[PDB]
Symmetry: C6
Subunit: 58 residues, 6 copies
Amino acid sequence: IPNFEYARRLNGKKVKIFLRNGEVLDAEVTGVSNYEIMVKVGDRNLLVFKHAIDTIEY
Amino acid sequence: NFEYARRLNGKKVKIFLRNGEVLDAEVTGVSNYEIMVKVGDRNLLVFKHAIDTIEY
Amino acid sequence: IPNFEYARRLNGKKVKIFLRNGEVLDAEVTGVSNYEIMVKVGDRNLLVFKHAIDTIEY
Amino acid sequence: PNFEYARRLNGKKVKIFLRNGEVLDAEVTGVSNYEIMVKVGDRNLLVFKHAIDTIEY
Amino acid sequence: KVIPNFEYARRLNGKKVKIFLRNGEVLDAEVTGVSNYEIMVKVGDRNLLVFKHAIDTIEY
Amino acid sequence: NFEYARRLNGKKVKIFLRNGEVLDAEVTGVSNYEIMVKVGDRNLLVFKHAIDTIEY
Ligand SMILES: Nc1ncnc2c1ncn2[C@@H]1O[C@H](COP(=O)(O)O)[C@@H](O)[C@H]1O
Ligand SMILES: Nc1ncnc2c1ncn2[C@@H]1O[C@H](COP(=O)(O)O)[C@@H](O)[C@H]1O
Ligand SMILES: [Cl-]
Ligand code: NA
């Protein structure tokens, strides 16, 4: 388990999450754990596994 | 090692799998690497590595 | 809680293993380690890496 | 635990089903935590375990 | 480990590189940070967090 | 932990990547997660997770 990750400072930000299948989420980040990012996308709440993310634009 | 996935135990969720399948699931258990679910009359062990997103 | 997993509880059971490539194994589980599942499928003996498994129906 | 079922395969003839759909008719010559060393035909290969789906033995 | 284990990627911090992602994209990138799990880059006028698991190769 | 990959340093090898590309490579360094190579007139950092097999 890493002690430092840049993903932590994404909390509360509006970002673009590029998923490994080619979909993109216009997301607001509501939580970050070592392996998950929690987001709101429109009216949906999602848990996103980091392993399913390629890049995040912020 | 805090995880949000553990908060989902007992809840109805939609699990989006890496192959494109979507599970209309009730979460029955969560471990470090697995999520146990009921889907219809099926009982499944789902590996987290095979999950992309979960809608809850 | 260290090393707790549900997969080892499938030991000795008949299960359906859904592999990441879309193949499905009608399997009898004979052993479970941290990263591997040992199974019998018909007359074949297989080592299945957990990373290659999507779901197991039991 | 310091246990791997893959270690049972050392020195054995096996079929390795890779994630890309290829199958290796392999003789296992070594097993590390992350790799399986094999002879296939006249070739020596390092096979990463993460690229393996199943092994028939 | 507070002092990182050796990795070649940290030598690329501050450099211009081409990152080849698993999805077939190439990023013309300036590396601005490296963690255990991520590589931070500037691409055009975009700021990206790139997960190492999504990278195949880096040409430098 | 033991890595067979360390033994490949300085050798000419064929690296079969997960996307189907094949690198005709000279290995110039090996770390826990990376293999550094020369291919043509290019220098590449290759993540081990992107490699399927290496012929050597
Ligand atoms: N220590 C942990 N605690 C909780 N979940 C984990 C842990 N390690 C890995 N995971 C999850 O399991 C997936 C597969 O693990 P790995 O094969 O180690 O990458 C990860 O991408 C996470 O979603
Ligand atoms: N402690 C670490 N030091 C350097 N790179 C790492 C470390 N942990 C993970 N990585 C990289 O991040 C990738 C993530 O894969 P995984 O750990 O399997 O989710 C690995 O394949 C490595 O390239
Ligand atoms: Cl650095
Ligand atoms: Na650390």
